[PDB]
């Protein structure tokens, strides 16, 4: 997250931290995700496409820090890793960039709701906030484009939804953005998601309910003028989600 503010898991208790094991045993951070039911985390396909073996991954819930344990956290293996069959990427855009992880602990259990672990509601179909609406993004991704390290403490910020018509202008992203994507950015371009935030939640208030409106997917650079963050539009994937869960 470029700009924004530090936070803790209590302010985004559906946030899932996804790591990968390496041959040799070191574990490194991959991507964010969102807990949509006790046994199911939703994320981005591009996070896993190069190493699609479910045994490679570890999922934490209730975690506020990247490389230290948070009190109350739960650790899970990935029972099933479901990537979107119509995924595709070009130099920039990632199409159908959505993935489901069925989580299960060593004891055979799913998430137990607590003060630090809660689910997030899905939107109703084709129901998104109007353009200019402020929404939240959360993650452990870079604080600057040029950073080598990821922040050790969870961050969040606010971005505003951009209309498809505006995001499709040539000076923004042209035809690389589809109707199954949502664009969001800061009016001054000073805050944004970045590398390592992929798979994490874009949350908006809809009908007086906190709702998973987007999944961090792609962008050209981070917090760069005329280059919004691009998010998988969750309200266009409800049949895919319901069928695979």
């Amino acid at each position: 997250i470029i700009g924004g503010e530090f936070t803790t898991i209590e302010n985004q208790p559906w946030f899932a931290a996804i790591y990968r094991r390496h041959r040799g045993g070191s574990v490194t951070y991959v991507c964010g995700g969102s807990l949509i039911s006790p046994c199911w985390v939703i994320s981005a396909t591009h996070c896993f496409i190069d190493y699609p073996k479910k045994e490679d991954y570890i999922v934490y819930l209730g975690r506020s820090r990247l490389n230290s344990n948070t009190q109350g956290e739960m650790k899970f293996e990935v029972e099933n890793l479901i990537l979107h069959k119509d995924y595709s990427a070009d130099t920039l855009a990632h199409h159908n960039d959505i993935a489901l992880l069925k989580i299960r602990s060593k004891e055979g259990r799913c998430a137990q709701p607590s003060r630090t672990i809660q689910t997030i509601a899905l939107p109703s179909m084709y129901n998104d906030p109007q353009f200019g609406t402020s929404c939240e993004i959360t993650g452990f991704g870079k604080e600057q484009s040029t950073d080598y390290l990821y922040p050790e403490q969870l961050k969040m910020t606010v971005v505003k939804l951009i209309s498809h018509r505006e995001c499709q202008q040539p000076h923004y992203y042209g035809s690389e953005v589809t109707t199954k994507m949502l664009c969001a950015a800061d009016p001054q371009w000073k805050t944004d998601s970045c590398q390592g935030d992929s798979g994490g939640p874009l949350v908006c208030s809809l009908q007086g309910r906190m709702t998973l409106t987007g999944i961090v997917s792609w962008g050209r650079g981070c917090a760069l003028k005329d280059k919004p963050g691009v998010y998988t539009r969750v309200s266009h994937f409800l049949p895919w989600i319901r069928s695979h869960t």
């Binding site: 591009h46 896993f48 190493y51 970045c194 590398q195 992929s198 961090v216 997917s217 962008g219």
Partner: peptide
């Protein structure tokens, strides 16, 4: 570059 962007996390080339 591309490898420092959203889209190429956990990629073999990067």
């Amino acid at each position: 570059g591309a490898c420092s962007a959203r889209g190429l996390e956990n990629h073999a080339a990067c």
